[PDB]
Amino acid sequence: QALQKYSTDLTARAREGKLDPVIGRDNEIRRVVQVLSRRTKNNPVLIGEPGVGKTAIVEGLAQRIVAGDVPESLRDKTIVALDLGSMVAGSKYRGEFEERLKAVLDDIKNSAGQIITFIDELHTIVGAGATAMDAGNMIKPMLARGELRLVGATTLDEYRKHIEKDAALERRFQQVYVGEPSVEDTIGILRGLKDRYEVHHGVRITDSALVAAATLSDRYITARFLPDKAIDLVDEAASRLRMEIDSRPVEIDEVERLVRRLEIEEMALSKEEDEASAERLAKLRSELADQKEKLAELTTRWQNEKNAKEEVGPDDIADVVSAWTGIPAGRLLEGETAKLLRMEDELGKRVIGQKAAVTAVSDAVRRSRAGVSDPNRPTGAFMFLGPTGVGKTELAKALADFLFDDERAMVRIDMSEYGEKHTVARLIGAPPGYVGYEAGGQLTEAVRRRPYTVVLFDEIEKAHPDVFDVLLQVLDEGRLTDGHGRTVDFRNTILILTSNLGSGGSAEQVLAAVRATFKPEFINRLDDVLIFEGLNPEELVRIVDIQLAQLGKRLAQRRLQLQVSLPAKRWLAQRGFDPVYGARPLRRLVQQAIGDQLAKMLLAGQVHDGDTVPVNVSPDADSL
Amino acid sequence: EIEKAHPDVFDVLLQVLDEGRLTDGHGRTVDFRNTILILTSNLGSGGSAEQVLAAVRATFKPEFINRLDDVLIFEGLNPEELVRI
Ligand SMILES: Nc1ncnc2c1ncn2[C@@H]1O[C@H](COP(=O)(O)OP(=O)(O)OP(O)(O)=S)[C@@H](O)[C@H]1O
Ligand SMILES: Nc1ncnc2c1ncn2[C@@H]1O[C@H](COP(=O)(O)OP(=O)(O)OP(O)(O)=S)[C@@H](O)[C@H]1O
């Protein structure tokens, strides 16, 4: 009767129909049974990485016993699930734990070998009751004679951290290696599990959902194992769909929540006795109106759809895989097809010229959302080089902004400090046993979180010619391994290597300097090797416009603006001389010609905030 | 890409070949007598057969070349065997 108090009954629940169906894994249950019915030392231990199904096998064995598919020796055996947590509950005295253990062992032995105990995560049995080794090995005499059977299951690396350190007890256990299944098997598993979820959430599930989940959960989420990271997607999709069968769907409930906040802000900002908050209000109202338009449009379209979405499909799974591990995995639902077709002209707002290199980046971004590029290879690996001041770093910063709306979201490393060979260790970590080890790598541990960024290697030509080799595997496929032995995936980042070889020689001399500075097997990894071009006087007026736009945007903090005459706008670009320093002289000239005079006149009255100022050319300089 | 490493990891591999054993910190001897050991490389880079066979000999030691089985040499791609790739 001690059992009734210190353990539950598994076979009883299997009869009462409370365990999930178990599909496949025939070899494993066969081996478990045949080990479980031998003469001496019959103690199978299911071992293997976490998630691949190790409790599911024991539940399958229980349902199999209830059914009758077992051999003769295992008829009516009444599996029992032990519990060592509720056994050490209150035993602060000297013998209170050994007493309970002896009672349970005696009642297991009194039965005619019927009971089949089952300790889940038996790596906790080692130090059961400590004080001096006495407890947890009182069963060691009964294991050998095979009186109690004890099918248990622990993870693969808590078996050599807790048990293998006890070689006298490992001897009494037989290991059953449970390897993870493939996609074709996971699909079959899901096809039989697609009823409990479909009934718990009042929805229906298409078979395409199962297929797409079992595929995407293997392609993207490279940190868990397969029978589980595929069930999670299905489960979350179903829960979301049931949440939307409530009153309103998403994308209407978000816009109404935004509108309410904008309203409650505009209602309480109106009574502000100020003049600078007048413009800080003049935009809030416009925003509220332009959002209420969208709300009304969505609400009307819902009415049409409802007078003229009830099962999960192969794209809601993509929405989940995008919301978790923010890699975009969708199918271009018309929100951004226009954007990806406008990409070139949109990156033109910040970068000017070098269409030969803008088109090359845009094409690599584009043919990956359409699902055409190599799924196991980086999303693109370019090294664009050319003379200075031309805009290579600028294009790399414009791309990250166009993609994530925050230029500080990309991962940037400056390869000008890696001049010494030994300085490699700061991006792959330090081996075990050395000073900085628990911190892990640095590039690795940044790409391991949010693996959608853009990676930038400035001035690649200045690092020692031995950091070039840590990038071979990184460019050819997405793998790089830190100290702890974990591996990160680069398969969906966009690498970029800005350089400066062959300052202004030719488009042929620079291709003869690259081939002498790099190795034949390293150039072979790259995509197109883009070459940038010097700037023309006609490409420079637009840069003047950009600089003035930025300066005005910065000045608008103090409520100013400038009226620049076209004579001055062309004078500035006329003084952007010397196509040997690119386009920085323009910046320093704008400073030395406008910023200093503006400061002068600004911190001495006469240009008080508010009113704008005009700028006009003079004989030589330009005055205000 | 084995020739890119430091010539001490070779000496670690020295007993993996020819015996299939190496023991870690915990003092557990691990056996390799059933694996298939494969080492790629890119030495020589164009030498016919003895600009490469003598560039292996000057980067590795005889006691390391001696454990190996045949040192396979790969060959460039003819125009015919690309219409199939
Ligand atoms: N062969 C299978 N048939 C049916 N369901 C399975 C199968 N393998 C795994 N599952 C399900 O996938 C999940 C796997 O969970 P478990 O296998 O119980 O966890 P585990 O594999 O024991 O890993 P730990 O170490 O116990 S956390 C559960 O939801 C199971 O129901
Ligand atoms: N085509 C361009 N379009 C817009 N701004 C440009 C362009 N070319 C240069 N600029 C400006 O020039 C600044 C400096 O150019 P960068 O590209 O940062 O220098 P670089 O191209 O990296 O050359 P090096 O070798 O790195 S010094 C940028 O911040 C821009 O403001």
mmCIF file of C-alpha atoms in Angstrom, chain A residues 290-563:
data_model
loop_
_atom_site.group_PDB
_atom_site.id
_atom_site.type_symbol
_atom_site.label_atom_id
_atom_site.label_comp_id
_atom_site.label_asym_id
_atom_site.label_seq_id
_atom_site.Cartn_x
_atom_site.Cartn_y
_atom_site.Cartn_z
ATOM 1 C CA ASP A 290 -5.003 59.206 -41.535
ATOM 2 C CA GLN A 291 -5.301 56.277 -39.137
ATOM 3 C CA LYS A 292 -9.068 56.598 -38.726
ATOM 4 C CA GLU A 293 -9.386 56.426 -42.504
ATOM 5 C CA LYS A 294 -7.607 53.062 -42.448
ATOM 6 C CA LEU A 295 -9.744 51.828 -39.562
ATOM 7 C CA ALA A 296 -12.937 52.675 -41.437
ATOM 8 C CA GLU A 297 -11.666 51.049 -44.631
ATOM 9 C CA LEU A 298 -10.765 47.809 -42.848
ATOM 10 C CA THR A 299 -14.096 47.771 -41.026
ATOM 11 C CA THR A 300 -16.006 48.181 -44.290
ATOM 12 C CA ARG A 301 -14.017 45.437 -46.021
ATOM 13 C CA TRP A 302 -14.776 43.094 -43.125
ATOM 14 C CA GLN A 303 -18.487 43.733 -43.666
ATOM 15 C CA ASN A 304 -18.194 42.768 -47.330
ATOM 16 C CA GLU A 305 -16.293 39.591 -46.467
ATOM 17 C CA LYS A 306 -18.915 38.769 -43.821
ATOM 18 C CA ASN A 307 -22.038 39.347 -45.952
ATOM 19 C CA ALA A 308 -20.797 37.860 -49.238
ATOM 20 C CA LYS A 309 -10.704 32.189 -42.333
ATOM 21 C CA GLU A 310 -11.802 29.131 -40.366
ATOM 22 C CA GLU A 311 -8.820 26.784 -40.668
ATOM 23 C CA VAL A 312 -5.074 27.125 -40.317
ATOM 24 C CA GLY A 313 -3.086 27.075 -43.521
ATOM 25 C CA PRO A 314 0.470 26.864 -44.818
ATOM 26 C CA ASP A 315 0.997 30.592 -44.199
ATOM 27 C CA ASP A 316 -0.225 31.128 -40.647
ATOM 28 C CA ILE A 317 2.666 28.842 -39.761
ATOM 29 C CA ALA A 318 4.858 31.319 -41.613
ATOM 30 C CA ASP A 319 3.398 34.132 -39.521
ATOM 31 C CA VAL A 320 4.381 32.234 -36.377
ATOM 32 C CA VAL A 321 7.891 31.459 -37.635
ATOM 33 C CA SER A 322 8.241 35.145 -38.421
ATOM 34 C CA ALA A 323 6.976 36.372 -35.050
ATOM 35 C CA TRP A 324 9.454 34.021 -33.353
ATOM 36 C CA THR A 325 12.987 34.290 -34.723
ATOM 37 C CA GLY A 326 12.052 37.412 -36.670
ATOM 38 C CA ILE A 327 13.377 36.108 -39.991
ATOM 39 C CA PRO A 328 10.637 37.031 -42.499
ATOM 40 C CA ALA A 329 9.240 33.738 -43.759
ATOM 41 C CA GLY A 330 5.981 34.928 -45.326
ATOM 42 C CA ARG A 331 4.743 34.785 -48.912
ATOM 43 C CA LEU A 332 4.719 38.468 -49.943
ATOM 44 C CA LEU A 333 1.126 39.330 -49.038
ATOM 45 C CA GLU A 334 0.999 42.464 -51.206
ATOM 46 C CA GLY A 335 2.137 44.684 -48.348
ATOM 47 C CA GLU A 336 5.721 44.742 -49.575
ATOM 48 C CA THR A 337 5.754 43.467 -53.156
ATOM 49 C CA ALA A 338 5.440 47.101 -54.211
ATOM 50 C CA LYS A 339 8.269 47.910 -51.806
ATOM 51 C CA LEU A 340 10.598 45.248 -53.188
ATOM 52 C CA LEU A 341 9.819 46.451 -56.692
ATOM 53 C CA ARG A 342 10.571 50.043 -55.660
ATOM 54 C CA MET A 343 13.772 49.034 -53.808
ATOM 55 C CA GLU A 344 16.232 50.626 -56.252
ATOM 56 C CA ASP A 345 14.484 53.989 -56.479
ATOM 57 C CA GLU A 346 14.042 53.919 -52.717
ATOM 58 C CA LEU A 347 17.723 53.311 -51.956
ATOM 59 C CA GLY A 348 18.327 56.183 -54.332
ATOM 60 C CA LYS A 349 17.089 58.653 -51.717
ATOM 61 C CA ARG A 350 20.330 58.260 -49.744
ATOM 62 C CA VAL A 351 22.895 56.862 -52.211
ATOM 63 C CA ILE A 352 23.537 58.420 -55.626
ATOM 64 C CA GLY A 353 25.242 56.776 -58.564
ATOM 65 C CA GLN A 354 26.613 53.243 -58.620
ATOM 66 C CA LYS A 355 23.483 51.719 -60.099
ATOM 67 C CA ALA A 356 25.749 48.847 -61.142
ATOM 68 C CA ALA A 357 26.139 48.055 -57.436
ATOM 69 C CA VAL A 358 22.683 49.005 -56.162
ATOM 70 C CA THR A 359 21.012 46.642 -58.618
ATOM 71 C CA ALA A 360 23.304 43.806 -57.519
ATOM 72 C CA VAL A 361 22.333 44.150 -53.855
ATOM 73 C CA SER A 362 18.655 44.575 -54.665
ATOM 74 C CA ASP A 363 18.601 41.439 -56.808
ATOM 75 C CA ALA A 364 20.034 39.340 -53.991
ATOM 76 C CA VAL A 365 17.476 40.748 -51.572
ATOM 77 C CA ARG A 366 14.713 40.121 -54.091
ATOM 78 C CA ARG A 367 15.312 36.595 -55.274
ATOM 79 C CA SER A 368 15.320 35.365 -51.704
ATOM 80 C CA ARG A 369 11.784 36.419 -50.778
ATOM 81 C CA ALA A 370 10.455 34.752 -53.925
ATOM 82 C CA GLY A 371 11.986 31.491 -52.714
ATOM 83 C CA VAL A 372 14.585 30.938 -55.427
ATOM 84 C CA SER A 373 18.001 31.314 -53.773
ATOM 85 C CA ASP A 374 19.992 28.483 -52.224
ATOM 86 C CA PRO A 375 18.375 27.672 -48.856
ATOM 87 C CA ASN A 376 21.685 26.556 -47.298
ATOM 88 C CA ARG A 377 24.122 29.331 -48.232
ATOM 89 C CA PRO A 378 24.239 32.963 -47.041
ATOM 90 C CA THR A 379 21.668 35.313 -48.546
ATOM 91 C CA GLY A 380 24.537 37.091 -50.305
ATOM 92 C CA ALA A 381 28.252 37.815 -49.877
ATOM 93 C CA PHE A 382 29.504 40.898 -51.719
ATOM 94 C CA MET A 383 32.808 42.747 -51.534
ATOM 95 C CA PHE A 384 32.477 46.128 -53.217
ATOM 96 C CA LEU A 385 35.664 48.174 -53.537
ATOM 97 C CA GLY A 386 36.789 51.410 -55.149
ATOM 98 C CA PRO A 387 38.348 54.789 -54.373
ATOM 99 C CA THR A 388 37.569 56.839 -51.254
ATOM 100 C CA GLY A 389 34.583 59.055 -50.517
ATOM 101 C CA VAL A 390 32.532 57.175 -53.092
ATOM 102 C CA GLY A 391 29.828 55.658 -50.930
ATOM 103 C CA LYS A 392 30.532 52.012 -50.173
ATOM 104 C CA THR A 393 29.939 52.305 -46.430
ATOM 105 C CA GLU A 394 26.999 54.579 -47.208
ATOM 106 C CA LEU A 395 25.250 51.920 -49.281
ATOM 107 C CA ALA A 396 25.778 49.395 -46.498
ATOM 108 C CA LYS A 397 24.217 51.735 -43.966
ATOM 109 C CA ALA A 398 21.340 52.575 -46.314
ATOM 110 C CA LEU A 399 20.526 48.902 -46.843
ATOM 111 C CA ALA A 400 20.196 48.199 -43.121
ATOM 112 C CA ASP A 401 17.910 51.201 -42.697
ATOM 113 C CA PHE A 402 15.741 50.212 -45.640
ATOM 114 C CA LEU A 403 15.429 46.726 -44.138
ATOM 115 C CA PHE A 404 14.965 47.233 -40.371
ATOM 116 C CA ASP A 405 14.269 51.002 -40.037
ATOM 117 C CA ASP A 406 17.231 51.368 -37.648
ATOM 118 C CA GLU A 407 20.831 51.659 -38.836
ATOM 119 C CA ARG A 408 21.974 50.604 -35.355
ATOM 120 C CA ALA A 409 20.327 47.211 -35.908
ATOM 121 C CA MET A 410 23.067 45.798 -38.126
ATOM 122 C CA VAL A 411 26.185 44.116 -36.774
ATOM 123 C CA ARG A 412 29.292 46.130 -37.619
ATOM 124 C CA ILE A 413 32.891 45.112 -36.941
ATOM 125 C CA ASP A 414 35.907 47.204 -37.926
ATOM 126 C CA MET A 415 38.557 44.940 -39.414
ATOM 127 C CA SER A 416 41.198 47.650 -39.080
ATOM 128 C CA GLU A 417 42.044 46.648 -35.495
ATOM 129 C CA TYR A 418 42.630 42.979 -36.382
ATOM 130 C CA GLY A 419 46.141 43.732 -37.549
ATOM 131 C CA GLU A 420 47.755 41.047 -35.412
ATOM 132 C CA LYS A 421 47.049 37.398 -36.144
ATOM 133 C CA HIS A 422 46.264 36.520 -32.536
ATOM 134 C CA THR A 423 43.449 39.084 -32.472
ATOM 135 C CA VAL A 424 41.165 36.539 -34.129
ATOM 136 C CA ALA A 425 40.071 35.122 -30.792
ATOM 137 C CA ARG A 426 37.772 38.063 -30.094
ATOM 138 C CA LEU A 427 35.176 36.880 -32.615
ATOM 139 C CA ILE A 428 35.203 33.120 -32.034
ATOM 140 C CA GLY A 429 35.749 32.989 -28.277
ATOM 141 C CA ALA A 430 38.391 31.302 -26.190
ATOM 142 C CA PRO A 431 38.855 27.539 -25.817
ATOM 143 C CA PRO A 432 37.869 25.696 -22.644
ATOM 144 C CA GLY A 433 40.159 26.348 -19.708
ATOM 145 C CA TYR A 434 41.252 29.890 -20.592
ATOM 146 C CA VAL A 435 40.451 33.291 -19.169
ATOM 147 C CA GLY A 436 37.454 34.583 -21.054
ATOM 148 C CA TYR A 437 35.434 31.454 -21.689
ATOM 149 C CA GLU A 438 31.931 31.774 -20.266
ATOM 150 C CA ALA A 439 31.296 34.874 -22.377
ATOM 151 C CA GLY A 440 31.377 32.936 -25.639
ATOM 152 C CA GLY A 441 32.210 34.458 -28.986
ATOM 153 C CA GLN A 442 31.390 38.008 -29.989
ATOM 154 C CA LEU A 443 30.393 37.963 -33.644
ATOM 155 C CA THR A 444 28.943 34.510 -33.048
ATOM 156 C CA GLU A 445 27.010 35.503 -29.945
ATOM 157 C CA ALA A 446 25.551 38.474 -31.781
ATOM 158 C CA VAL A 447 24.402 36.541 -34.853
ATOM 159 C CA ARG A 448 22.972 33.866 -32.555
ATOM 160 C CA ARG A 449 20.382 36.412 -31.414
ATOM 161 C CA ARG A 450 18.121 37.847 -34.105
ATOM 162 C CA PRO A 451 19.777 36.045 -37.048
ATOM 163 C CA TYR A 452 18.447 38.402 -39.712
ATOM 164 C CA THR A 453 20.956 41.234 -39.464
ATOM 165 C CA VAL A 454 23.461 42.604 -41.967
ATOM 166 C CA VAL A 455 27.138 41.986 -41.242
ATOM 167 C CA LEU A 456 29.732 44.585 -42.253
ATOM 168 C CA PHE A 457 33.502 44.073 -42.413
ATOM 169 C CA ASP A 458 35.019 47.526 -42.936
ATOM 170 C CA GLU A 459 38.476 47.909 -44.481
ATOM 171 C CA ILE A 460 39.063 44.213 -44.967
ATOM 172 C CA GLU A 461 42.421 44.792 -46.645
ATOM 173 C CA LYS A 462 44.194 45.929 -43.467
ATOM 174 C CA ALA A 463 43.707 42.860 -41.279
ATOM 175 C CA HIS A 464 46.390 40.202 -41.040
ATOM 176 C CA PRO A 465 46.236 37.674 -43.895
ATOM 177 C CA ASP A 466 45.032 35.017 -41.471
ATOM 178 C CA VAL A 467 41.669 36.438 -40.462
ATOM 179 C CA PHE A 468 40.710 35.893 -44.100
ATOM 180 C CA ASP A 469 40.560 32.152 -43.415
ATOM 181 C CA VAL A 470 38.072 32.235 -40.558
ATOM 182 C CA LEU A 471 35.614 33.463 -43.186
ATOM 183 C CA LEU A 472 35.957 30.571 -45.643
ATOM 184 C CA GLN A 473 33.238 28.410 -44.119
ATOM 185 C CA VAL A 474 31.254 31.536 -43.212
ATOM 186 C CA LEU A 475 31.043 32.584 -46.846
ATOM 187 C CA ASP A 476 30.559 29.157 -48.389
ATOM 188 C CA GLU A 477 27.748 28.206 -45.994
ATOM 189 C CA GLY A 478 26.303 29.602 -42.868
ATOM 190 C CA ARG A 479 28.306 27.843 -40.178
ATOM 191 C CA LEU A 480 30.808 29.145 -37.629
ATOM 192 C CA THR A 481 31.658 27.416 -34.344
ATOM 193 C CA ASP A 482 32.659 29.191 -31.132
ATOM 194 C CA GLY A 483 34.505 27.800 -28.114
ATOM 195 C CA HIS A 484 31.654 26.005 -26.344
ATOM 196 C CA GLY A 485 31.152 23.905 -29.473
ATOM 197 C CA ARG A 486 27.868 25.448 -30.537
ATOM 198 C CA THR A 487 27.340 26.447 -34.156
ATOM 199 C CA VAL A 488 25.472 29.481 -35.444
ATOM 200 C CA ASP A 489 23.733 29.774 -38.797
ATOM 201 C CA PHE A 490 24.501 32.602 -41.207
ATOM 202 C CA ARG A 491 22.160 31.247 -43.881
ATOM 203 C CA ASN A 492 20.000 34.376 -43.817
ATOM 204 C CA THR A 493 22.405 37.282 -43.311
ATOM 205 C CA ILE A 494 23.864 39.578 -45.958
ATOM 206 C CA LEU A 495 27.627 39.821 -45.663
ATOM 207 C CA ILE A 496 29.519 42.865 -46.924
ATOM 208 C CA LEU A 497 33.266 43.514 -47.249
ATOM 209 C CA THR A 498 34.296 47.090 -48.000
ATOM 210 C CA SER A 499 37.824 47.545 -49.300
ATOM 211 C CA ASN A 500 40.133 50.103 -50.875
ATOM 212 C CA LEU A 501 42.752 48.269 -52.964
ATOM 213 C CA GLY A 502 43.914 49.800 -56.229
ATOM 214 C CA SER A 503 43.032 53.349 -55.218
ATOM 215 C CA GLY A 504 42.211 54.685 -58.671
ATOM 216 C CA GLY A 505 44.220 52.563 -61.074
ATOM 217 C CA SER A 506 41.641 51.047 -63.435
ATOM 218 C CA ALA A 507 38.916 48.430 -63.463
ATOM 219 C CA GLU A 508 41.702 46.037 -64.491
ATOM 220 C CA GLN A 509 44.524 47.063 -62.151
ATOM 221 C CA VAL A 510 42.260 46.646 -59.147
ATOM 222 C CA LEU A 511 41.320 43.154 -60.329
ATOM 223 C CA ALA A 512 45.048 42.438 -60.478
ATOM 224 C CA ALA A 513 45.586 43.765 -56.964
ATOM 225 C CA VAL A 514 42.709 41.762 -55.486
ATOM 226 C CA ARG A 515 44.086 38.577 -57.012
ATOM 227 C CA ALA A 516 47.498 39.264 -55.478
ATOM 228 C CA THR A 517 46.186 40.202 -52.040
ATOM 229 C CA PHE A 518 43.674 37.365 -51.622
ATOM 230 C CA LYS A 519 43.803 33.631 -52.218
ATOM 231 C CA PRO A 520 42.248 31.850 -55.201
ATOM 232 C CA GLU A 521 39.943 29.830 -52.943
ATOM 233 C CA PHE A 522 38.684 32.898 -51.093
ATOM 234 C CA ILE A 523 37.651 34.956 -54.116
ATOM 235 C CA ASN A 524 35.820 31.866 -55.353
ATOM 236 C CA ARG A 525 33.405 32.082 -52.418
ATOM 237 C CA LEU A 526 32.172 35.594 -53.126
ATOM 238 C CA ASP A 527 29.270 36.682 -55.250
ATOM 239 C CA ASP A 528 29.772 39.557 -57.682
ATOM 240 C CA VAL A 529 32.832 41.656 -56.840
ATOM 241 C CA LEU A 530 31.408 45.135 -57.340
ATOM 242 C CA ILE A 531 33.611 48.084 -58.286
ATOM 243 C CA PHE A 532 32.643 51.646 -57.448
ATOM 244 C CA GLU A 533 33.286 54.689 -59.623
ATOM 245 C CA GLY A 534 34.470 58.245 -59.153
ATOM 246 C CA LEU A 535 31.902 60.988 -58.948
ATOM 247 C CA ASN A 536 30.819 63.359 -61.712
ATOM 248 C CA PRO A 537 29.945 67.045 -61.378
ATOM 249 C CA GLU A 538 26.374 66.141 -62.339
ATOM 250 C CA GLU A 539 26.122 63.494 -59.618
ATOM 251 C CA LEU A 540 27.260 65.998 -57.073
ATOM 252 C CA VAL A 541 24.421 68.534 -57.150
ATOM 253 C CA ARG A 542 22.053 65.873 -55.836
ATOM 254 C CA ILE A 543 24.525 65.192 -53.032
ATOM 255 C CA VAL A 544 24.415 68.905 -52.244
ATOM 256 C CA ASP A 545 20.639 68.594 -52.021
ATOM 257 C CA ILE A 546 21.014 65.665 -49.616
ATOM 258 C CA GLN A 547 23.463 67.508 -47.373
ATOM 259 C CA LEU A 548 21.187 70.536 -47.210
ATOM 260 C CA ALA A 549 18.238 68.275 -46.428
ATOM 261 C CA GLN A 550 20.085 66.720 -43.494
ATOM 262 C CA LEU A 551 21.267 70.083 -42.187
ATOM 263 C CA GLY A 552 17.743 71.486 -42.362
ATOM 264 C CA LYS A 553 16.329 68.426 -40.625
ATOM 265 C CA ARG A 554 18.850 68.944 -37.831
ATOM 266 C CA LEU A 555 18.114 72.667 -37.566
ATOM 267 C CA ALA A 556 14.364 72.004 -37.368
ATOM 268 C CA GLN A 557 14.910 71.109 -33.706
ATOM 269 C CA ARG A 558 15.125 74.842 -32.970
ATOM 270 C CA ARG A 559 12.449 75.720 -35.572
ATOM 271 C CA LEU A 560 14.540 77.144 -38.388
ATOM 272 C CA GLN A 561 14.868 76.578 -42.112
ATOM 273 C CA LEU A 562 16.971 77.935 -44.943
ATOM 274 C CA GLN A 563 16.099 79.340 -48.368
#
